[PDB]
């Protein structure tokens, strides 16, 4: 079960809670790389180029 | 300006809409935070939807 879109925007600021998390600011754009774990998604920041986990209810489709 | 549901959602509160993946909506108010007021184009019903569950057509 996945998302039909792949380009997302942060609705809120987020501070990484673990080394493999991204930190990000509201407005930051992402490409989603793996949504299959549900609550946590792997994403690429389109600002930093970095890959890591984001909380899936912090982002919405652009 | 149509939006489409990416996922099914089962709402358990009075004012929130339930909907199915693919259901189409007109957005009525996105100004009040991340729950938007919308009209379902299936039922004609208005209520709130979580804005991360829909995308522009």
């Amino acid at each position: 079960g996945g998302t039909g879109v792949t380009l997302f925007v942060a609705l809120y600021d987020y501070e990484a809670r673990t080394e493999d998390d991204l930190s990000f600011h509201k407005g930051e754009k992402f490409q989603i790389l793996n949504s299959s774990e549900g609550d946590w998604w792997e994403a690429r920041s389109l600002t930093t180029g970095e890959t890591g986990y984001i909380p899936s209810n912090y982002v919405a489709p652009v | 300006t149509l939006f489409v549901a990416l996922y099914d959602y089962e709402a358990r509160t009075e004012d929130d809409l339930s909907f199915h993946k693919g259901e189409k909506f007109q957005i009525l108010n996105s100004s009040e935070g991340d729950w938007w007021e919308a009209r379902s184009l299936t039922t004609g019903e208005t209520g709130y939807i979580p804005s991360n569950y829909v995308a522009p057509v």
Binding site: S35, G38, W41, S56, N57 | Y7, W35, S51, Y53
Partner: peptide, 7 residues
């Protein structure tokens, strides 16, 4: 206060 998608 948004739900997590059911992915």
């Amino acid at each position: 206060s948004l739900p997590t998608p059911p992915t």
